[PDB]
Amino acid sequence: DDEEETYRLWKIRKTIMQLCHDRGYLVTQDELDQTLEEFKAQFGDKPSEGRPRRTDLTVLVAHNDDPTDQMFVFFPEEPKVGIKTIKVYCQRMQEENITRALIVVQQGMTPSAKQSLVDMAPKYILEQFLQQELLINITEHELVPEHVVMTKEEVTELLARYKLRENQLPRIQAGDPVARYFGIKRGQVVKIIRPSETAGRYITYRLVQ
Amino acid sequence: QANQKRITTPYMTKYERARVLGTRALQIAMCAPVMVELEGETDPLLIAMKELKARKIPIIIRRYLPDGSYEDWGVDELIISD
Amino acid sequence: FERMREDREVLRVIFPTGDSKVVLPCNLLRMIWNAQKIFHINPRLPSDLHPIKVVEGVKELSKKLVIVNGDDPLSRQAQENATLLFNIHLRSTLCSRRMA
Secondary structure: OOHHHHHHHHHHHHHHHHHHHHHOEEOOHHHHOOOHHHHHHHOOOEOOOOEOOOOOOOEEEEEOOOOOOEEEEEOOOOOEEOHHHHHHHHHHHHHOOOOEEEEEEOOEEOHHHHHHHHHOOOOOEEEEEEHHHHOOOHHHOOOOOEEEEOOHHHHHHHHHHHOOOHHHOOEEOOOOHHHHHHOOOOOOEEEEEEEEOOOEEEEEEEEEO | OOOOOOOOOOEOOHHHHHHHHHHHHHHHHOOOOOOOOOOOOOOHHHHHHHHHHHOOOOOEEEEEOOOOOEEEEEOOOOEOOO | OHHHHHHHHHHHHHOOOOOOOOOOOOOHHHHHHHHHHHOOOOOOOOOOOOHHHHHHHHHHHHHHOOOOOOOOHHHHHHHHHHOHHHHHHHHHHOOOOOOO
16 A cells, blocks of 8 residues: 555656656666665655655756756646646746656546647647556567667768658657657657567668657 | 769669560560571570670660669679579 | 677577577578588698688678668668678688688
């Protein structure tokens, strides 16, 4: 009832740290591999009482290439998140002049809140995640190969090399678990490196849609 | 496309060979001039085949690329494998 | 030897199971046997093949097998990954020690 909640919170934090590290954000090695005991000593083992409360788990990291390019990770306490909570976090971001954020919901999200995640897209690029899908890092799976987000320069060179247009490359849905994990949007190209029993290594490139 | 830098394979494909022998055989059947010797060859197929082995076929293969460009490879520039 | 040790680990990550059976274009063991019979090689007499010629020959051959044409790093990376499994089976079969 309680030891499992703290275990889940720890596992989610570890996965989030791995996710931010994979997106290119500055994450220290200590917090990247934090044991359950270290987490209980830094945060607690009493989430039912409120120690630690989900509001304490808020993370704030900065990009390796740009220090001002920060990103938020919020853990709401209500199972079903409403529009008011999004307004709170959006205002929080406005106050702290941050543009990118993550909402790790417990049960799910209301329709109006999802639409609120779509209308403020050019101003605040904020995403949503379910704690049930964050308890495991999908990139460590054997079926999931190594994905790498390409830069506009690398894509221009790719398209100029094979002499093809963007609509000709294979596609990947923006709602794909890996696409959501790496936080990629339409127009971006993701480079996949997978092992092959015929050539050893195969590099493919997928366009997001 | 710049003929100085042709990216296609230097070998003649099985399909290119098939169509080359076929079209050249048709030409010979229409009384076209022969380039090589004909000691005992009349059947246009055997004549076109000896011409391929001799590498004396006056045909250019226009290999179309997906982008829309093309590379003109002559039968003498390609390496016959079979 | 170091290059073959790196390739050894590359195969360990490619083939996590102990299944060395692989499909490749050219059978090196039969070609080697054919050369043994074509030139009447005596396995009991010393060889006149310098191991440096073996290493240099394998590197030049690996450069002649071109699945992807282009000197740019993107093409060189694709070429290096396409002929990878073959170049590994080649360097492991045409090794200077095995050839000696």
